[PDB]
Amino acid sequence: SHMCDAFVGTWKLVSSENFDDYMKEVGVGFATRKVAGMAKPNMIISVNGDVITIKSESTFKNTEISFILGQEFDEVTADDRKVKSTITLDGGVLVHVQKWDGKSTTIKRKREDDKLVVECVMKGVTSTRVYERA
Ligand SMILES: CCN(CC)c1nc2c(c(-c3ccncc3)c1-c1nnn[nH]1)CCCCC2
C-alpha cells in the first residue's frame, strides 16, 4: 500500500458549486461553459508503480493524464488549453498546478469521508466539486 491508495477508484460527480464563476475566471467561453457545466463526469484514478493516471469521462469530453509526482508534463485540458502541469502530494492532498499564457490555476483533490472533494482555484474564485464512488 502506498501513496495514493485512498484515491484509487471510479468517482462520479454529485455536486458542484461556483464552477461557472471558476470557468469565467479561467477565460472559458460561453458555449463551453454551458455544455461543460451540464456534465456529470467520472474521475477514474489508478496507480501503476510511480505513475498515476487520472481519466475524466464525460458527455462533454474525455481526457486523461498520466504523471509522476513532482515532474512537469504537458496537458491539454477539456476546454482545449495547452498547459504545463505539475502534481504533488502535500499532506495527503493531490495538488495540481496548471500554467499557461502567464496564468496559473490550482486544483486540489482530497479524500473526505467517502467522498473525493475537488477544490478549483483561479485568482480569488474557488469552485468545490464533490464526487462519490461509482
Ligand atoms: C478544474 C478541474 N476540473 C474539475 C475536476 C475540470 N476542469 C475543466 C473542465 C472539466 C470538465 C471535464 C469534462 N466534462 C466537464 C467538465 C473539469 C472536470 N474534470 N472532471 N470533472 N470535471 C472543462 C471545463 C472548463 C474548465 C476546465
CSV table of N, CA and C and ligand atoms in Angstrom, one decimal:
chain,number,residue,atom,x,y,z
A,1,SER,N,0.9,-1.2,0.0
A,1,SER,CA,0.0,0.0,0.0
A,1,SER,C,0.9,1.2,0.0
A,2,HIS,N,0.4,2.3,-0.4
A,2,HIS,CA,1.2,3.3,-0.9
A,2,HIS,C,0.4,4.5,-1.2
A,3,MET,N,1.0,5.4,-2.0
A,3,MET,CA,1.0,6.9,-1.9
A,3,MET,C,-0.4,7.5,-2.0
A,4,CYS,N,-1.1,6.9,-2.9
A,4,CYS,CA,-2.4,7.3,-3.3
A,4,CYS,C,-3.5,6.3,-3.2
A,5,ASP,N,-3.4,5.3,-2.3
A,5,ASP,CA,-4.4,4.2,-2.3
A,5,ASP,C,-5.8,4.6,-2.1
A,6,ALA,N,-6.0,5.6,-1.2
A,6,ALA,CA,-7.4,6.0,-0.9
A,6,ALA,C,-8.0,6.9,-2.1
A,7,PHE,N,-7.2,7.3,-3.1
A,7,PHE,CA,-7.8,8.0,-4.2
A,7,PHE,C,-8.2,7.0,-5.4
A,8,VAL,N,-7.7,5.8,-5.4
A,8,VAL,CA,-7.9,4.9,-6.5
A,8,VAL,C,-9.3,4.5,-6.6
A,9,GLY,N,-9.9,4.5,-7.8
A,9,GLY,CA,-11.3,4.2,-8.0
A,9,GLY,C,-11.9,5.0,-9.1
A,10,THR,N,-13.3,4.8,-9.2
A,10,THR,CA,-14.1,5.5,-10.1
A,10,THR,C,-15.0,6.4,-9.3
A,11,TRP,N,-15.0,7.7,-9.6
A,11,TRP,CA,-15.7,8.7,-8.8
A,11,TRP,C,-16.6,9.5,-9.7
A,12,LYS,N,-17.9,9.6,-9.3
A,12,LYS,CA,-18.9,10.3,-10.1
A,12,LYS,C,-19.3,11.6,-9.5
A,13,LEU,N,-19.3,12.7,-10.3
A,13,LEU,CA,-19.7,14.0,-9.8
A,13,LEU,C,-21.1,13.9,-9.2
A,14,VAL,N,-21.3,14.4,-8.0
A,14,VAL,CA,-22.6,14.6,-7.3
A,14,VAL,C,-23.0,16.0,-7.0
A,15,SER,N,-22.0,16.9,-6.8
A,15,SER,CA,-22.4,18.3,-6.6
A,15,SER,C,-21.3,19.2,-7.1
A,16,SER,N,-21.7,20.4,-7.5
A,16,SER,CA,-20.8,21.4,-7.9
A,16,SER,C,-21.3,22.8,-7.4
A,17,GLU,N,-20.3,23.6,-6.9
A,17,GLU,CA,-20.6,25.0,-6.6
A,17,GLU,C,-19.6,25.9,-7.2
A,18,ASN,N,-20.2,27.0,-7.8
A,18,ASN,CA,-19.4,28.1,-8.4
A,18,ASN,C,-18.5,27.7,-9.5
A,19,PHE,N,-18.8,26.6,-10.2
A,19,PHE,CA,-17.9,26.2,-11.3
A,19,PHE,C,-18.1,27.2,-12.5
A,20,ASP,N,-19.3,27.7,-12.7
A,20,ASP,CA,-19.4,28.7,-13.8
A,20,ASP,C,-18.4,29.9,-13.6
A,21,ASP,N,-18.4,30.4,-12.3
A,21,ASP,CA,-17.5,31.5,-12.0
A,21,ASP,C,-16.1,31.2,-12.1
A,22,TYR,N,-15.7,30.0,-11.7
A,22,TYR,CA,-14.3,29.5,-11.9
A,22,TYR,C,-14.0,29.5,-13.4
A,23,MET,N,-14.9,28.9,-14.2
A,23,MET,CA,-14.6,28.8,-15.6
A,23,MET,C,-14.5,30.3,-16.2
A,24,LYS,N,-15.3,31.2,-15.8
A,24,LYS,CA,-15.2,32.6,-16.3
A,24,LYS,C,-13.9,33.2,-15.9
A,25,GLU,N,-13.4,32.9,-14.7
A,25,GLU,CA,-12.1,33.4,-14.3
A,25,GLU,C,-10.9,32.9,-15.1
A,26,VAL,N,-11.0,31.6,-15.4
A,26,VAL,CA,-10.1,30.9,-16.3
A,26,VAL,C,-10.0,31.5,-17.7
A,27,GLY,N,-11.1,32.0,-18.2
A,27,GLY,CA,-11.3,32.5,-19.5
A,27,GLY,C,-12.0,31.7,-20.5
A,28,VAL,N,-12.8,30.7,-20.0
A,28,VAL,CA,-13.6,29.8,-20.8
A,28,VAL,C,-14.7,30.5,-21.4
A,29,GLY,N,-15.0,30.3,-22.7
A,29,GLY,CA,-16.0,30.9,-23.4
A,29,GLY,C,-17.4,30.4,-23.1
A,30,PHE,N,-18.4,31.2,-23.5
A,30,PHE,CA,-19.8,31.0,-23.1
A,30,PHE,C,-20.3,29.6,-23.5
A,31,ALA,N,-20.1,29.1,-24.7
A,31,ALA,CA,-20.7,27.9,-25.2
A,31,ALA,C,-20.1,26.7,-24.4
A,32,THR,N,-18.7,26.7,-24.3
A,32,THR,CA,-18.1,25.7,-23.5
A,32,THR,C,-18.5,25.7,-22.0
A,33,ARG,N,-18.7,26.9,-21.4
A,33,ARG,CA,-19.2,26.9,-20.0
A,33,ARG,C,-20.5,26.2,-19.9
A,34,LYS,N,-21.4,26.5,-20.8
A,34,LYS,CA,-22.8,26.0,-20.7
A,34,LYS,C,-22.8,24.5,-20.9
A,35,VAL,N,-22.1,24.0,-21.9
A,35,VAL,CA,-22.1,22.5,-22.1
A,35,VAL,C,-21.2,21.8,-21.1
A,36,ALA,N,-20.1,22.3,-20.8
A,36,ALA,CA,-19.2,21.6,-19.8
A,36,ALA,C,-19.9,21.6,-18.4
A,37,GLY,N,-20.6,22.7,-18.1
A,37,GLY,CA,-21.2,22.8,-16.8
A,37,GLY,C,-22.3,21.8,-16.6
A,38,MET,N,-23.0,21.4,-17.6
A,38,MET,CA,-24.0,20.3,-17.6
A,38,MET,C,-23.5,18.9,-17.2
A,39,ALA,N,-22.3,18.6,-17.5
A,39,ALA,CA,-21.8,17.2,-17.5
A,39,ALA,C,-21.7,16.8,-16.0
A,40,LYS,N,-21.8,15.5,-15.8
A,40,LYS,CA,-21.6,14.8,-14.6
A,40,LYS,C,-20.5,13.8,-14.8
A,41,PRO,N,-19.2,14.3,-14.8
A,41,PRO,CA,-18.1,13.4,-15.2
A,41,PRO,C,-17.8,12.3,-14.2
A,42,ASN,N,-17.2,11.2,-14.6
A,42,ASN,CA,-16.5,10.3,-13.8
A,42,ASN,C,-15.0,10.6,-13.8
A,43,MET,N,-14.4,10.6,-12.7
A,43,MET,CA,-13.0,10.7,-12.5
A,43,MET,C,-12.4,9.4,-12.1
A,44,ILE,N,-11.6,8.8,-12.9
A,44,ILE,CA,-11.1,7.4,-12.7
A,44,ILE,C,-9.6,7.5,-12.4
A,45,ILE,N,-9.2,7.1,-11.2
A,45,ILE,CA,-7.9,7.3,-10.7
A,45,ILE,C,-7.2,5.9,-10.5
A,46,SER,N,-6.0,5.7,-11.0
A,46,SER,CA,-5.3,4.4,-10.9
A,46,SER,C,-3.8,4.7,-10.7
A,47,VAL,N,-3.1,3.7,-10.2
A,47,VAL,CA,-1.7,3.8,-10.0
A,47,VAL,C,-1.0,2.6,-10.4
A,48,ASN,N,0.1,2.7,-11.1
A,48,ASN,CA,0.9,1.6,-11.5
A,48,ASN,C,2.4,2.0,-11.2
A,49,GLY,N,3.0,1.4,-10.2
A,49,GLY,CA,4.3,1.9,-9.8
A,49,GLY,C,4.3,3.4,-9.4
A,50,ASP,N,5.2,4.2,-10.0
A,50,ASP,CA,5.2,5.6,-9.7
A,50,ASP,C,4.3,6.4,-10.6
A,51,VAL,N,3.6,5.8,-11.5
A,51,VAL,CA,2.8,6.5,-12.5
A,51,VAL,C,1.3,6.5,-12.0
A,52,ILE,N,0.8,7.7,-11.8
A,52,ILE,CA,-0.6,7.9,-11.5
A,52,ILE,C,-1.3,8.3,-12.8
A,53,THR,N,-2.5,7.7,-13.0
A,53,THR,CA,-3.4,8.0,-14.2
A,53,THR,C,-4.7,8.6,-13.7
A,54,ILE,N,-5.1,9.7,-14.2
A,54,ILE,CA,-6.4,10.3,-13.9
A,54,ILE,C,-7.2,10.5,-15.2
A,55,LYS,N,-8.2,9.8,-15.4
A,55,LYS,CA,-9.1,10.0,-16.5
A,55,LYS,C,-10.4,10.7,-16.1
A,56,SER,N,-10.8,11.6,-17.0
A,56,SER,CA,-12.1,12.2,-16.8
A,56,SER,C,-13.0,11.8,-18.0
A,57,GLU,N,-14.1,11.2,-17.7
A,57,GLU,CA,-15.0,10.7,-18.7
A,57,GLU,C,-16.3,11.4,-18.6
A,58,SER,N,-16.7,12.0,-19.7
A,58,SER,CA,-18.0,12.8,-19.6
A,58,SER,C,-18.6,12.9,-21.0
A,59,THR,N,-19.9,13.3,-20.9
A,59,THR,CA,-20.6,13.6,-22.2
A,59,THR,C,-20.0,14.9,-22.9
A,60,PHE,N,-19.3,15.7,-22.2
A,60,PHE,CA,-18.7,16.9,-22.8
A,60,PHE,C,-17.4,16.5,-23.5
A,61,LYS,N,-16.5,15.9,-22.8
A,61,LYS,CA,-15.2,15.5,-23.4
A,61,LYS,C,-14.5,14.5,-22.5
A,62,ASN,N,-13.8,13.5,-23.0
A,62,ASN,CA,-13.0,12.6,-22.3
A,62,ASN,C,-11.6,13.1,-22.4
A,63,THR,N,-10.9,13.1,-21.2
A,63,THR,CA,-9.5,13.4,-21.1
A,63,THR,C,-8.7,12.5,-20.2
A,64,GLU,N,-7.4,12.5,-20.3
A,64,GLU,CA,-6.6,11.6,-19.5
A,64,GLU,C,-5.3,12.3,-19.3
A,65,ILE,N,-4.7,12.1,-18.0
A,65,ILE,CA,-3.4,12.5,-17.7
A,65,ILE,C,-2.7,11.3,-17.0
A,66,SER,N,-1.4,11.1,-17.3
A,66,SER,CA,-0.6,10.2,-16.5
A,66,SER,C,0.7,11.0,-16.1
A,67,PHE,N,1.2,10.8,-14.9
A,67,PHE,CA,2.2,11.6,-14.4
A,67,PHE,C,3.0,10.9,-13.2
A,68,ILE,N,4.1,11.5,-12.9
A,68,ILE,CA,4.9,11.2,-11.8
A,68,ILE,C,4.9,12.4,-10.9
A,69,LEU,N,4.7,12.2,-9.6
A,69,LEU,CA,4.6,13.4,-8.7
A,69,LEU,C,5.9,14.2,-8.8
A,70,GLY,N,5.7,15.5,-8.9
A,70,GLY,CA,6.8,16.5,-8.9
A,70,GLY,C,7.4,16.7,-10.3
A,71,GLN,N,7.0,16.0,-11.3
A,71,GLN,CA,7.6,16.0,-12.6
A,71,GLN,C,6.6,16.7,-13.6
A,72,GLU,N,7.0,17.8,-14.1
A,72,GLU,CA,6.1,18.6,-15.0
A,72,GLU,C,5.8,17.8,-16.3
A,73,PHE,N,4.6,18.0,-16.8
A,73,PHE,CA,4.1,17.4,-18.0
A,73,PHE,C,3.2,18.3,-18.8
A,74,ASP,N,3.1,18.0,-20.1
A,74,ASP,CA,2.1,18.7,-21.0
A,74,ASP,C,0.7,18.2,-20.8
A,75,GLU,N,-0.3,19.0,-20.8
A,75,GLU,CA,-1.6,18.7,-20.6
A,75,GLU,C,-2.5,19.5,-21.6
A,76,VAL,N,-3.5,18.8,-22.2
A,76,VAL,CA,-4.5,19.5,-23.0
A,76,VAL,C,-5.8,19.4,-22.2
A,77,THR,N,-6.3,20.5,-21.7
A,77,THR,CA,-7.4,20.5,-20.8
A,77,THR,C,-8.7,20.2,-21.7
A,78,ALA,N,-9.8,19.9,-21.0
A,78,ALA,CA,-11.1,19.6,-21.7
A,78,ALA,C,-11.6,20.8,-22.5
A,79,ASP,N,-11.3,22.0,-22.1
A,79,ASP,CA,-11.6,23.3,-22.8
A,79,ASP,C,-10.5,23.7,-23.8
A,80,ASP,N,-9.5,22.8,-24.1
A,80,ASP,CA,-8.5,23.0,-25.1
A,80,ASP,C,-7.4,24.0,-24.8
A,81,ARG,N,-7.2,24.2,-23.5
A,81,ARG,CA,-5.9,24.9,-23.1
A,81,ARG,C,-4.8,24.0,-23.2
A,82,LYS,N,-3.6,24.5,-23.7
A,82,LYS,CA,-2.4,23.8,-23.7
A,82,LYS,C,-1.6,24.3,-22.5
A,83,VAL,N,-1.5,23.4,-21.5
A,83,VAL,CA,-0.9,23.9,-20.2
A,83,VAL,C,0.3,23.1,-19.8
A,84,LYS,N,1.1,23.6,-19.0
A,84,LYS,CA,2.2,22.8,-18.4
A,84,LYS,C,1.8,22.6,-16.9
A,85,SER,N,1.8,21.3,-16.5
A,85,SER,CA,1.2,20.9,-15.2
A,85,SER,C,2.2,20.2,-14.4
A,86,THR,N,2.1,20.4,-13.0
A,86,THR,CA,2.8,19.7,-12.1
A,86,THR,C,1.9,19.3,-10.9
A,87,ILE,N,2.0,18.0,-10.5
A,87,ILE,CA,1.1,17.5,-9.5
A,87,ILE,C,2.0,16.9,-8.4
A,88,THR,N,1.7,17.3,-7.1
A,88,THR,CA,2.5,16.9,-6.0
A,88,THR,C,1.5,16.4,-4.9
A,89,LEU,N,2.0,15.7,-3.9
A,89,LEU,CA,1.2,15.3,-2.7
A,89,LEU,C,1.6,16.2,-1.6
A,90,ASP,N,0.7,17.0,-1.0
A,90,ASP,CA,1.0,17.8,0.1
A,90,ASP,C,0.1,17.5,1.3
A,91,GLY,N,0.7,16.9,2.3
A,91,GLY,CA,-0.2,16.5,3.4
A,91,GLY,C,-1.4,15.6,3.0
A,92,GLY,N,-1.1,14.7,2.1
A,92,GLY,CA,-2.2,13.8,1.7
A,92,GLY,C,-3.2,14.3,0.7
A,93,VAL,N,-3.0,15.5,0.2
A,93,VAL,CA,-3.8,16.2,-0.8
A,93,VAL,C,-3.0,16.2,-2.1
A,94,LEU,N,-3.6,15.8,-3.2
A,94,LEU,CA,-3.0,16.0,-4.6
A,94,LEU,C,-3.2,17.4,-5.0
A,95,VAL,N,-2.1,18.1,-5.3
A,95,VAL,CA,-2.1,19.5,-5.6
A,95,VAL,C,-1.6,19.6,-7.1
A,96,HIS,N,-2.5,20.1,-8.0
A,96,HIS,CA,-2.3,20.1,-9.4
A,96,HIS,C,-2.3,21.5,-9.9
A,97,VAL,N,-1.1,22.0,-10.3
A,97,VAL,CA,-1.0,23.4,-10.8
A,97,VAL,C,-0.8,23.3,-12.3
A,98,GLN,N,-1.7,24.1,-13.0
A,98,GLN,CA,-1.6,24.3,-14.5
A,98,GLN,C,-1.2,25.7,-14.8
A,99,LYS,N,-0.2,25.8,-15.7
A,99,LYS,CA,0.4,27.1,-16.1
A,99,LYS,C,0.2,27.3,-17.6
A,100,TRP,N,-0.3,28.4,-18.1
A,100,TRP,CA,-0.4,28.7,-19.5
A,100,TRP,C,-0.5,30.2,-19.7
A,101,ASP,N,0.0,30.8,-20.7
A,101,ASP,CA,-0.1,32.2,-21.1
A,101,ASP,C,0.1,33.1,-19.9
A,102,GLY,N,1.0,32.8,-19.0
A,102,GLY,CA,1.3,33.7,-17.9
A,102,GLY,C,0.3,33.6,-16.8
A,103,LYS,N,-0.7,32.6,-16.9
A,103,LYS,CA,-1.7,32.4,-15.9
A,103,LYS,C,-1.4,31.1,-15.2
A,104,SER,N,-2.1,30.9,-14.1
A,104,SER,CA,-2.0,29.7,-13.2
A,104,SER,C,-3.3,29.4,-12.5
A,105,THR,N,-3.7,28.1,-12.4
A,105,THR,CA,-4.8,27.6,-11.6
A,105,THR,C,-4.4,26.4,-10.9
A,106,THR,N,-5.0,26.2,-9.7
A,106,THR,CA,-4.6,25.1,-8.8
A,106,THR,C,-5.9,24.3,-8.5
A,107,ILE,N,-5.8,23.0,-8.7
A,107,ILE,CA,-6.8,22.0,-8.4
A,107,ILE,C,-6.4,21.1,-7.3
A,108,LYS,N,-7.1,21.0,-6.2
A,108,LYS,CA,-6.7,20.1,-5.1
A,108,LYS,C,-7.7,19.0,-5.0
A,109,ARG,N,-7.3,17.8,-4.9
A,109,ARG,CA,-8.1,16.6,-4.8
A,109,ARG,C,-7.8,16.0,-3.4
A,110,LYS,N,-8.9,15.9,-2.6
A,110,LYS,CA,-8.7,15.3,-1.2
A,110,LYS,C,-9.8,14.3,-0.9
A,111,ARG,N,-9.4,13.3,-0.1
A,111,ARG,CA,-10.4,12.3,0.4
A,111,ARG,C,-11.0,12.8,1.7
A,112,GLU,N,-12.3,12.9,1.7
A,112,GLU,CA,-13.0,13.4,2.9
A,112,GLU,C,-14.2,12.5,3.1
A,113,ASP,N,-14.2,11.7,4.2
A,113,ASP,CA,-15.3,10.8,4.4
A,113,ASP,C,-15.3,9.8,3.2
A,114,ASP,N,-16.4,9.5,2.7
A,114,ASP,CA,-16.5,8.6,1.5
A,114,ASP,C,-16.4,9.3,0.2
A,115,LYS,N,-16.1,10.6,0.2
A,115,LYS,CA,-16.1,11.5,-1.0
A,115,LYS,C,-14.7,11.8,-1.4
A,116,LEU,N,-14.6,12.2,-2.7
A,116,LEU,CA,-13.4,12.9,-3.2
A,116,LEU,C,-13.9,14.4,-3.5
A,117,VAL,N,-13.3,15.3,-2.8
A,117,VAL,CA,-13.6,16.7,-2.8
A,117,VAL,C,-12.5,17.4,-3.6
A,118,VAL,N,-13.0,18.1,-4.6
A,118,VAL,CA,-12.1,18.8,-5.6
A,118,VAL,C,-12.3,20.3,-5.5
A,119,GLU,N,-11.3,21.1,-5.1
A,119,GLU,CA,-11.3,22.5,-4.9
A,119,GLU,C,-10.5,23.1,-6.0
A,120,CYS,N,-11.1,23.9,-6.8
A,120,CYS,CA,-10.5,24.5,-8.1
A,120,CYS,C,-10.4,26.0,-7.9
A,121,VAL,N,-9.2,26.6,-7.9
A,121,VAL,CA,-9.0,28.0,-7.6
A,121,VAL,C,-8.4,28.7,-8.8
A,122,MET,N,-8.9,29.9,-9.1
A,122,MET,CA,-8.4,30.8,-10.1
A,122,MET,C,-8.5,32.2,-9.5
A,123,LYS,N,-7.3,32.8,-9.3
A,123,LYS,CA,-7.3,34.0,-8.6
A,123,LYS,C,-8.1,34.0,-7.3
A,124,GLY,N,-9.1,34.9,-7.1
A,124,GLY,CA,-9.9,34.9,-5.9
A,124,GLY,C,-11.1,34.0,-6.0
A,125,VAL,N,-11.3,33.2,-7.0
A,125,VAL,CA,-12.5,32.4,-7.2
A,125,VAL,C,-12.2,30.9,-6.9
A,126,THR,N,-13.1,30.3,-6.1
A,126,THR,CA,-13.0,28.9,-5.8
A,126,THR,C,-14.3,28.2,-6.2
A,127,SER,N,-14.1,27.0,-6.7
A,127,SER,CA,-15.2,26.1,-7.0
A,127,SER,C,-15.0,24.8,-6.3
A,128,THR,N,-16.0,24.2,-5.7
A,128,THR,CA,-15.9,22.9,-5.0
A,128,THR,C,-16.8,21.9,-5.7
A,129,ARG,N,-16.2,20.8,-6.1
A,129,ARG,CA,-16.9,19.7,-6.8
A,129,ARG,C,-16.7,18.5,-6.0
A,130,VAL,N,-17.8,17.8,-5.7
A,130,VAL,CA,-17.8,16.6,-4.8
A,130,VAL,C,-18.1,15.4,-5.6
A,131,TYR,N,-17.4,14.3,-5.5
A,131,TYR,CA,-17.5,13.1,-6.3
A,131,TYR,C,-17.7,11.9,-5.3
A,132,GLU,N,-18.5,11.0,-5.6
A,132,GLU,CA,-18.8,9.8,-4.8
A,132,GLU,C,-18.4,8.5,-5.6
A,133,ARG,N,-18.2,7.4,-4.9
A,133,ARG,CA,-17.8,6.2,-5.6
A,133,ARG,C,-18.9,5.7,-6.5
A,134,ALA,N,-18.5,5.3,-7.7
A,134,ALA,CA,-19.4,4.9,-8.8
A,134,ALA,C,-19.9,3.5,-8.6
B,1,LIG,C1,-10.9,22.4,-12.6
B,1,LIG,C2,-10.6,20.9,-13.0
B,1,LIG,N1,-11.7,20.1,-13.4
B,1,LIG,C3,-12.6,19.8,-12.3
B,1,LIG,C4,-12.2,18.5,-11.6
B,1,LIG,C5,-12.2,20.3,-14.7
B,1,LIG,N2,-11.7,21.4,-15.3
B,1,LIG,C6,-12.2,21.8,-16.5
B,1,LIG,C7,-13.2,21.1,-17.2
B,1,LIG,C8,-13.7,19.9,-16.6
B,1,LIG,C9,-14.7,19.1,-17.3
B,1,LIG,C10,-14.3,17.9,-17.9
B,1,LIG,C11,-15.3,17.1,-18.5
B,1,LIG,N3,-16.6,17.4,-18.5
B,1,LIG,C12,-17.0,18.6,-17.9
B,1,LIG,C13,-16.0,19.3,-17.3
B,1,LIG,C14,-13.2,19.5,-15.3
B,1,LIG,C15,-13.6,18.2,-14.7
B,1,LIG,N4,-12.9,17.1,-14.9
B,1,LIG,N5,-13.6,16.1,-14.2
B,1,LIG,N6,-14.7,16.7,-13.7
B,1,LIG,N7,-14.7,18.0,-14.0
B,1,LIG,C16,-13.7,21.6,-18.5
B,1,LIG,C17,-14.5,23.0,-18.4
B,1,LIG,C18,-13.6,24.2,-18.3
B,1,LIG,C19,-12.6,24.2,-17.2
B,1,LIG,C20,-11.6,23.1,-17.1
